[PDB]
Design an enzyme around this catalytic site. Sequence first.
Site, PDB file in Angstrom:
ATOM      1  N   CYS A   1      14.408  10.957 -40.981  1.00 33.80           N
ATOM      2  CA  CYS A   1      13.107  10.464 -41.008  1.00 33.80           C
ATOM      3  C   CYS A   1      13.091   9.053 -41.752  1.00 33.80           C
ATOM      4  O   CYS A   1      13.213   9.035 -43.090  1.00 33.80           O
ATOM      5  CB  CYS A   1      11.864  11.318 -41.199  1.00 33.80           C
ATOM      6  SG  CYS A   1      10.319  10.794 -40.697  1.00 33.80           S
TER       7      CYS A   1
ATOM      8  N   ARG B   1       9.120   8.154 -43.884  1.00 31.36           N
ATOM      9  CA  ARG B   1       8.814   9.159 -44.986  1.00 31.36           C
ATOM     10  C   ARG B   1       7.920   8.360 -46.005  1.00 31.36           C
ATOM     11  O   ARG B   1       7.758   9.198 -47.197  1.00 31.36           O
ATOM     12  CB  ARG B   1      10.093   9.962 -45.676  1.00 31.36           C
ATOM     13  CG  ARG B   1      10.538  10.889 -44.812  1.00 31.36           C
ATOM     14  CD  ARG B   1      11.980  11.627 -45.440  1.00 31.36           C
ATOM     15  NE  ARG B   1      13.122  10.783 -45.046  1.00 31.36           N
ATOM     16  CZ  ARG B   1      14.283  11.089 -45.899  1.00 31.36           C
ATOM     17  NH1 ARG B   1      14.310  12.148 -46.653  1.00 31.36           N
ATOM     18  NH2 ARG B   1      15.312  10.272 -45.702  1.00 31.36           N
TER      19      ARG B   1
ATOM     20  N   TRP C   1       3.294   8.461 -35.976  1.00 31.87           N
ATOM     21  CA  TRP C   1       3.356   7.330 -34.884  1.00 31.87           C
ATOM     22  C   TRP C   1       4.504   6.758 -34.538  1.00 31.87           C
ATOM     23  O   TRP C   1       5.374   7.079 -35.424  1.00 31.87           O
ATOM     24  CB  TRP C   1       2.190   6.144 -35.539  1.00 31.87           C
ATOM     25  CG  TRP C   1       2.686   5.607 -36.679  1.00 31.87           C
ATOM     26  CD1 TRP C   1       3.508   4.690 -37.257  1.00 31.87           C
ATOM     27  CD2 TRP C   1       1.880   6.063 -38.007  1.00 31.87           C
ATOM     28  NE1 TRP C   1       3.472   4.350 -38.327  1.00 31.87           N
ATOM     29  CE2 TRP C   1       2.449   5.165 -38.984  1.00 31.87           C
ATOM     30  CE3 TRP C   1       0.604   6.875 -38.402  1.00 31.87           C
ATOM     31  CZ2 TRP C   1       1.953   5.197 -40.391  1.00 31.87           C
ATOM     32  CZ3 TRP C   1       0.510   6.821 -39.688  1.00 31.87           C
ATOM     33  CH2 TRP C   1       0.874   6.160 -40.687  1.00 31.87           C
TER      34      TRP C   1
ATOM     35  N   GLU D   1      11.960   3.506 -30.484  1.00 28.69           N
ATOM     36  CA  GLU D   1      11.905   4.620 -29.867  1.00 28.69           C
ATOM     37  C   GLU D   1      11.757   4.709 -28.600  1.00 28.69           C
ATOM     38  O   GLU D   1      12.278   5.368 -27.528  1.00 28.69           O
ATOM     39  CB  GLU D   1      11.149   5.593 -30.695  1.00 28.69           C
ATOM     40  CG  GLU D   1      11.401   6.366 -32.040  1.00 28.69           C
ATOM     41  CD  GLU D   1      10.356   7.318 -32.679  1.00 28.69           C
ATOM     42  OE1 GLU D   1      10.325   8.373 -32.314  1.00 28.69           O
ATOM     43  OE2 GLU D   1       9.645   6.519 -33.307  1.00 28.69           O
TER      44      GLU D   1
HETATM   45  C1  HEM Z   1       4.469   8.499 -39.828  1.00 24.94           C
HETATM   46  C2  HEM Z   1       5.206   7.850 -38.555  1.00 24.94           C
HETATM   47  C3  HEM Z   1       6.280   8.416 -38.449  1.00 24.94           C
HETATM   48  C4  HEM Z   1       7.472   7.448 -38.006  1.00 24.94           C
HETATM   49  C5  HEM Z   1       7.352   6.093 -37.916  1.00 24.94           C
HETATM   50  C6  HEM Z   1       8.703   8.345 -38.036  1.00 24.94           C
HETATM   51  C7  HEM Z   1       9.860   7.865 -37.667  1.00 24.94           C
HETATM   52  C8  HEM Z   1      11.003   8.723 -37.148  1.00 24.94           C
HETATM   53  C9  HEM Z   1      11.937   8.300 -36.302  1.00 24.94           C
HETATM   54  C10 HEM Z   1      12.274   6.974 -35.687  1.00 24.94           C
HETATM   55  C11 HEM Z   1      12.676   9.450 -36.361  1.00 24.94           C
HETATM   56  C12 HEM Z   1      13.960   9.579 -35.456  1.00 24.94           C
HETATM   57  C13 HEM Z   1      13.551   9.969 -33.937  1.00 24.94           C
HETATM   58  C14 HEM Z   1      14.690  10.079 -33.147  1.00 24.94           C
HETATM   59  O1  HEM Z   1      15.583   9.168 -33.085  1.00 24.94           O
HETATM   60  O2  HEM Z   1      14.690  11.109 -32.380  1.00 24.94           O
HETATM   61  C15 HEM Z   1      12.160  10.564 -37.197  1.00 24.94           C
HETATM   62  C16 HEM Z   1      12.967  11.803 -37.442  1.00 24.94           C
HETATM   63  C17 HEM Z   1      12.251  12.831 -37.986  1.00 24.94           C
HETATM   64  N1  HEM Z   1      10.815  12.647 -38.526  1.00 24.94           N
HETATM   65 FE1  HEM Z   1       9.818  11.045 -38.542  1.00 24.94          FE
HETATM   66  N2  HEM Z   1       8.177   9.579 -38.397  1.00 24.94           N
HETATM   67  C18 HEM Z   1       6.846   9.747 -38.764  1.00 24.94           C
HETATM   68  C19 HEM Z   1       6.344  10.691 -39.026  1.00 24.94           C
HETATM   69  C20 HEM Z   1       6.698  12.226 -39.308  1.00 24.94           C
HETATM   70  C21 HEM Z   1       6.189  13.405 -39.550  1.00 24.94           C
HETATM   71  C22 HEM Z   1       4.595  13.318 -39.756  1.00 24.94           C
HETATM   72  C23 HEM Z   1       7.020  14.280 -39.717  1.00 24.94           C
HETATM   73  C24 HEM Z   1       6.637  15.589 -39.818  1.00 24.94           C
HETATM   74  C25 HEM Z   1       5.802  16.131 -40.591  1.00 24.94           C
HETATM   75  C26 HEM Z   1       8.377  13.621 -39.561  1.00 24.94           C
HETATM   76  C27 HEM Z   1       9.337  14.430 -39.536  1.00 24.94           C
HETATM   77  C28 HEM Z   1      10.623  13.904 -38.816  1.00 24.94           C
HETATM   78  C29 HEM Z   1      11.910  14.820 -38.608  1.00 24.94           C
HETATM   79  C30 HEM Z   1      11.972  16.315 -39.160  1.00 24.94           C
HETATM   80  C31 HEM Z   1      12.923  14.005 -38.025  1.00 24.94           C
HETATM   81  C32 HEM Z   1      14.210  14.464 -37.773  1.00 24.94           C
HETATM   82  C33 HEM Z   1      14.437  15.034 -36.367  1.00 24.94           C
HETATM   83  C34 HEM Z   1      15.893  15.696 -36.212  1.00 24.94           C
HETATM   84  O3  HEM Z   1      16.429  16.104 -37.000  1.00 24.94           O
HETATM   85  O4  HEM Z   1      16.168  15.671 -34.528  1.00 24.94           O
HETATM   86  N3  HEM Z   1       8.290  12.422 -39.220  1.00 24.94           N
HETATM   87  N4  HEM Z   1      10.838  10.160 -37.703  1.00 24.94           N
HETATM   88  C1  S85 Z   2      16.470  13.619 -29.343  1.00 28.94           C
HETATM   89  N1  S85 Z   2      16.024  13.910 -30.893  1.00 28.94           N
HETATM   90  C2  S85 Z   2      15.828  15.263 -31.254  1.00 28.94           C
HETATM   91  C3  S85 Z   2      14.407  15.810 -30.466  1.00 28.94           C
HETATM   92  N2  S85 Z   2      13.532  16.237 -31.599  1.00 28.94           N
HETATM   93  C4  S85 Z   2      13.506  17.530 -31.901  1.00 28.94           C
HETATM   94  C5  S85 Z   2      12.973  15.219 -32.438  1.00 28.94           C
HETATM   95  C6  S85 Z   2      12.695  15.510 -33.706  1.00 28.94           C
HETATM   96  C7  S85 Z   2      11.769  14.556 -34.340  1.00 28.94           C
HETATM   97  F1  S85 Z   2      11.581  14.782 -35.666  1.00 28.94           F
HETATM   98  C8  S85 Z   2      11.648  13.509 -34.097  1.00 28.94           C
HETATM   99  C9  S85 Z   2      11.908  13.164 -32.771  1.00 28.94           C
HETATM  100  C10 S85 Z   2      11.237  11.529 -32.360  1.00 28.94           C
HETATM  101  C11 S85 Z   2       9.774  11.503 -32.161  1.00 28.94           C
HETATM  102  C12 S85 Z   2       9.023  11.220 -33.374  1.00 28.94           C
HETATM  103  C13 S85 Z   2       8.450  12.332 -34.103  1.00 28.94           C
HETATM  104  C14 S85 Z   2       7.514  11.950 -35.281  1.00 28.94           C
HETATM  105  C15 S85 Z   2       6.704  12.823 -36.191  1.00 28.94           C
HETATM  106  C16 S85 Z   2       7.215  10.518 -35.675  1.00 28.94           C
HETATM  107  C17 S85 Z   2       7.936   9.732 -34.639  1.00 28.94           C
HETATM  108  N3  S85 Z   2       7.798   8.169 -34.798  1.00 28.94           N
HETATM  109  N4  S85 Z   2       8.744  10.000 -33.528  1.00 28.94           N
HETATM  110  C18 S85 Z   2      12.526  13.979 -31.838  1.00 28.94           C
END
Ligand code: HEM
Ligand code: S85
Lengths: 403, 404
Positions: free
Chosen positions: A107, A110, A279, A284
């Site tokens: 993420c 963070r 957001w 993305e």
């Molecule tokens: C505040 C604005 C936020 C932005 C801009 C952001 C940005 C991102 C981005 C770009 C990814 C990669 C997404 C992808 O390529 O599929 C990601 C992954 C993730 N974010 Fe965020 N995030 C945000 C908030 C959050 C929140 C609120 C949570 C949970 C409470 C969170 C938990 C995660 C997790 C668990 C992943 C990993 C997903 C995976 O393993 O597939 N994020 N974040």
């Molecule tokens: C294809 N990737 C795996 C699909 N998946 C389970 C996923 C998990 C995320 F945490 C985040 C995302 C992307 C959506 C997302 C989620 C949040 C919380 C913020 C943000 N900017 N964008 C996908």
Amino acid sequence: KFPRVKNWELGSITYDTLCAQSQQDGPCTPRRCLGSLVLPRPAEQLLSQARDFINQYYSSIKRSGSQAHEERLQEVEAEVASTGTYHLRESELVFGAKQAWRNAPRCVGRIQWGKLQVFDARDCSSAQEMFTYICNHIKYATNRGNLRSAITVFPQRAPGRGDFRIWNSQLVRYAGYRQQDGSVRGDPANVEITELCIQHGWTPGNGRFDVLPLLLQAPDEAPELFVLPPELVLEVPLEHPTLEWFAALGLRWYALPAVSNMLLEIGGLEFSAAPFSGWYMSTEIGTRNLCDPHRYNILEDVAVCMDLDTRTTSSLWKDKAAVEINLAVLHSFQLAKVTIVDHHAATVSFMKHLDNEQKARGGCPADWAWIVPPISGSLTPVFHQEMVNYILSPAFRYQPDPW
Amino acid sequence: GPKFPRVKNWELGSITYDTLCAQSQQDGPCTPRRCLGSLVLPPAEQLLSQARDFINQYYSSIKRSGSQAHEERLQEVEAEVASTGTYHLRESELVFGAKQAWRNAPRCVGRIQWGKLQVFDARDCSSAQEMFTYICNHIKYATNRGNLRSAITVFPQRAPGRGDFRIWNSQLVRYAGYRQQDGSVRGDPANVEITELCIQHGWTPGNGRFDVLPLLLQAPDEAPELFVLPPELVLEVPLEHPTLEWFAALGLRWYALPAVSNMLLEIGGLEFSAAPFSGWYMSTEIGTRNLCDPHRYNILEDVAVCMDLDTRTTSSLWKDKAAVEINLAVLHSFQLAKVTIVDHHAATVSFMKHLDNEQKARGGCPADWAWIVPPISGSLTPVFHQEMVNYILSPAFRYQPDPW
Ligand code: HEM
Ligand SMILES: CNCCN(C)c1cc(F)cc(CCc2cc(C)cc(N)n2)c1
Ligand code: HEM
Ligand SMILES: CNCCN(C)c1cc(F)cc(CCc2cc(C)cc(N)n2)c1
Ligand SMILES: CNCCN(C)c1cc(F)cc(CCc2cc(C)cc(N)n2)c1
Ligand SMILES: C[C@H](O)[C@H](O)[C@H]1CNc2nc(N)[nH]c(=O)c2N1
Ligand SMILES: C[C@H](O)[C@H](O)[C@H]1CNc2nc(N)[nH]c(=O)c2N1
Ligand SMILES: [Zn+2]
């Protein structure tokens, strides 16, 4: 031995000591590195993860080793000893959710980890009720374009019974309709969930941006279909600040990225329905969702409107169209007053997060392949930064699809 | 499925298993508890097993595995080691090993070309002056007036109780980096230290942004010596832009020939401490890394100012728009100058073809995703959506400490 971590742009060096607290094994061994893989291939131990989590919670409030601290450890021991499980206090849950986000190596957002609204929905007993809570979350999170991070936590898994589950991978998803001839109308990522919806009785549309209903499931029941009220689902039509025909493409995206198929693990308890949202980072939508070949795949169409030389790779038509598409996303979100962050602003704030975490905790788990954006990698600072990936608890994890 | 790493392509939905990793004798930096994949840098009877291994690989490559010739080569190797503590490679063993080291290099995206590699044997070389003649020869053949050909020149192997042959420069062509009074750098900041070494060994410095460095070449147990490349051997390309007429006025340029000179080539336990090798560039190396890294020529802001972009806010994407144009200028100017170059779309497509060939030929291909994916337009290339398994196989190109 602790990892030596170097930044190649600044010449600076850190040592990650945090990884010593790693719970679980990742995919790598001394013989081969599997870092680039997207997916992975009783009571004594629930008790130790519980103890460990409760120790973290009390440490967080500096009342560690105190009265309340031991009485709570006693509660946990006494509850597990006779029911085989236990329950979190609401404030322990709030702490756990934020720590799960803090710990997510993939993420980039963070820096925001301490600010997260936590809705306790552990008193849900039907699909209908879950839908109530889901409407509250969306209305809250969206806040008319001024997005706020949130998570709603449905009841934990239980040894007996089937799980609470949201079948959709996000709360807002565009339908993907598989045509007679193998092409897809709409979002190809959502063909299977679209098909589940129809078969559980949904009347489909035929647009490219038809917002799906939700399939919600209470334990050991058939899932139920719920349509989101369209006024709750904020969307941004896409246009370009200088290319006037772009708006014509009729492209759009939703404001709210709310992930709904991941599992939240806190002190041994597992929450299999705990949808969370923040957001968008504009790549993305602009790079992945609209330009991936297996997603909306719009690059060539835009390149042709731009009237670029599509016949050869070396005119860099793809690179050029991609930049205009991302710019359209940013412009359009700013125009509609909906929160978004560009990949340069996001990665600069992620570097400040690494530094905060380096002081606060001795390191920070980060997944370099996910943190570096999908366009302009080396133009962002994170590209030049070595990172160490490892799994800490509380954590978000993948779980199997419920069907 | 099977008990080897499952590898997925997320764009196409297809699955392979890597069985080649089972062949890895050497460990990398990862463990079950943490991944260190993003870090840039992580004998007696011992020689014998590396030697026996390489000789088995050689006989398999010629399909003569288990044959009497195969067993006599093994005994020949143990004889020689047993009495001297080292041994010699046949010429064809050396050609095979050099190609295999390139084939094995997890960070190289250009491996579709691996079988096509011209190997100059210079195991007879015995002076810094002679190393210089070989290097000139290499540069001449490899440049070929713009029609670049891949090549390696192999200098004598380490030998017990005698110092090494080393080329001190990291590449055969490098622009000087001159540290300023005000603390900045004129030229390429990557070359500051080598530039200072050259001056200390008596080079008279220029003060341009693109001064070609001399070579510092060290024969066994001797101070290195300084050699100036005759300028007509070093082919250069002035950069212009196909539609932005002012880009030429910037006076930027890059050399034709990417030749790495400081890596150690390891074959069956033997070590070639000087074995410079060259190919042709992929355009992002120059256009994105060399010209736009903050710690390299760092030109992005200058170019965006000339293009009149709003450089005062990240969200105008001025960096992305300038980087695109600089990359376009590198491609256009090489094409124009008839100098071989490959763009990152053609290079990654060809590397997917390489993965498919290696999957059939050896059951996998070691590959370092963070280095294979290009530094602009990552997910617009097919390698972004390909999982990759990284491991060390031998013959190998390896990093070695700097000789000073
Ligand atoms: C505040 C604005 C936020 C932005 C801009 C952001 C940005 C991102 C981005 C770009 C990814 C990669 C997404 C992808 O390529 O599929 C990601 C992954 C993730 N974010 Fe965020 N995030 C945000 C908030 C959050 C929140 C609120 C949570 C949970 C409470 C969170 C938990 C995660 C997790 C668990 C992943 C990993 C997903 C995976 O393993 O597939 N994020 N974040
Ligand atoms: C294809 N990737 C795996 C699909 N998946 C389970 C996923 C998990 C995320 F945490 C985040 C995302 C992307 C959506 C997302 C989620 C949040 C919380 C913020 C943000 N900017 N964008 C996908
Ligand atoms: C023929 C055209 C070739 C192309 C386009 C090419 C492309 C590249 C690229 C883009 C890199 C990554 C460089 C970086 O960003 O640091 C690289 C790494 C490498 N290539 Fe090539 N390559 C070519 C030929 C060769 C040859 C002829 C050899 C050796 C015989 C070679 C061996 C390597 C090695 C060892 C590395 C990486 C070593 C490291 O930095 O750790 N390649 N290749
Ligand atoms: C191009 N390099 C040589 C080719 N080659 C492998 C070889 C040549 C020999 F003359 C003899 C041998 C047999 C082993 C041996 C034995 C002894 C005593 C000396 C020596 N140099 N080599 C191998
Ligand atoms: C952190 N490593 C940077 C310095 N270095 C040892 C290096 C090694 C290579 F094999 C290749 C390169 C890149 C130059 C190169 C080398 C060749 C042979 C072809 C090509 N297109 N590009 C650098
Ligand atoms: C195979 C490869 O690891 C995969 O395509 C990953 C790479 N990095 C990524 N990074 C982000 N943020 N999102 C992704 O979906 C991916 N996909
Ligand atoms: C920290 C990070 O691993 C480092 O900057 C890497 C990333 N990917 C790279 N990829 C290539 N081709 N070349 C490089 O020098 C690097 N640098
Ligand atoms: Zn790893």
